[PDB]
């Protein structure tokens, strides 16, 4: 099945998922000089005070921090969005080395990692219905650079030893995703896709300009995870990023001057 290797990685995905060659694929390179400021864009509203994390999962590609999305508890609104989008999960993409790992790039610069907070449009009732719509999802993307530790990340890092291999999960309650946000909510936005199979073209991307800092020790703990299942040959979970895809007929808009 699909992954990140030489034989199953991103250049192969189109054979099982032909939309991989579609008109609105993600990620993309953000050319800061050509993204236009759009004064019609609103501030983003991130309302995570009542978020209810439940569990962390190693799904064999990344790890997912899952939320209770059975009520309007953790919602994204505003920005480029019409209506209300509910948080369902977050996950990261990262590299083998600090010079790579992000999916989006900024003027061809790759960050050490990228965090995706995934939200679905409440007007479609559930996530599975939402991904079938062009405005079904809003993903908040946040770059990670290596420097100072991010204290709000350490609880995630802490737990990774318990979910080393594919299919392992652990209780992960009371985790506050606000501790993963940068100071500014300035952003770029464009229409795109999920960055993993099935690559559905259902996402409004909101990519924050300001990266968060994490320490080398934090990232090094992500790179100790395994893509394999228990008792199978060890293959370190690194370089689980899709490279930039063609922009095609899209505009990237900036919320800031």
What would you note in describing this structure?
The protein is mainly beta. The chain has one domain (1-257): Carbonic Anhydrase II (Roll). It contains 4 helices and 15 strands. The strands form 2 sheets. Strands 2, 3, 4, 5, 6, 7, 9, 10, 11, 12, 13, 14 and 15 form a 13-stranded mixed sheet that branches. The termini are far apart.
Helix and strand arrangement:
Layout: H1 13-16, E1 29-30, E2 36-37, E3 44-47, E4 53-58, E5 63-67, E6 75-78, E7 85-94, E8 105-106, E9 113-121, H2 127-130, E10 137-146, H3 154-159, E11 169-171, E12 187-192, E13 203-208, E14 212-214, H4 216-222, E15 253-254
Parallel strand pairs: 1-8, 2-15, 10-13, 10-14
Antiparallel strand pairs: 3-6, 4-5, 4-11, 5-7, 6-7, 7-9, 9-10, 12-13, 12-15
Which features does this protein show?
257 residues; mainly beta; Carbonic Anhydrase II; 13-stranded mixed beta sheet; two-stranded parallel ribbon; 15 strands; 8% helix; 29% strand; globular; metal binding protein
Output the structural class.
mainly beta
Number of strands: 15
Could you say what the CATH architecture is?
A: Roll
What is the CATH domain class?
Alpha Beta
Q: SSE order, as H and E?
A: HEEEEEEEEEHEHEEEEHE
Total helices: the number is 4
Describe the largest sheet: 13 strands, mixed
Q: Which word captures the global form?
A: globular
Strand % is: 25-35%
Distance N to C terminus: 44 Å
Indicate the percent of residues in helices.
under 10%
CATH homology-level superfamily: Alpha carbonic anhydrase
Say what the CATH topology is. Answer: Carbonic Anhydrase II
Question: How many domains?
Answer: 1
What gyration radius follows from the Cα positions, in whole Å?
17 Å
